[PDB]
């Protein structure tokens, strides 16, 4: 039962009212979480509305962090956009 969002739509969620990003083709709503994120707000704000896979993977987030991330998944990138965005 995967819920899809287009890249066009995701790009709209780029601000303090609603911040989404993409990690490995999934869509995360970090609007609230970014106020708590141990890595700070601005790394996430810079990524809002787009893919942040590379950045996320480079840090070496802990297994508890990676598990926490799953709680913010709201859907996945629409199939029509999956050539634009690397998994």
Residues that bind ligand HEM in the complex, under the rule CB under 6 A: 28, 30, 37-39, 43-44, 47, 52, 55-56, 59, 61-62, 64-65, 68-69, 72
Q: Supply the minimum distance, in Å, between the C-beta of residue 51 and Ca ion.
A: 23
Task: State how far the Cα of 47 lies from the Cα of 32, in Å rounded to an integer.
Answer: 15
CB contact at 8 A, 56 and 62: no
Determine if residue 25 is labeled as part of a ligand binding site.
no
Does 35 engage in binding with Ca ion (CB under 5 A)?
Answer: yes
By beta-carbon proximity to ligand HEM, the closer residue of 57 and 80 is 57
**Bridge partners for 19 per DSSP:** 14
- What's the number of CA atoms in the CB half-sphere (13 Å) around residue 51? 17
């Amino acid at each position: 039962a995967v819920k899809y969002y287009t890249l066009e739509e995701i790009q709209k969620h780029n601000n303090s009212k609603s911040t989404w990003l993409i990690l490995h083709h999934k869509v995360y709503d970090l609007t609230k979480f970014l106020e708590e994120h141990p890595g700070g707000e601005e790394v996430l704000r810079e990524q809002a509305g787009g893919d942040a896979t590379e950045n996320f993977e480079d840090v070496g987030h802990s297994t508890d962090a990676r598990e926490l991330s799953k709680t913010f998944i709201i859907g996945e990138l629409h199939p029509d956009d999956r050539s634009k965005i690397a998994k």
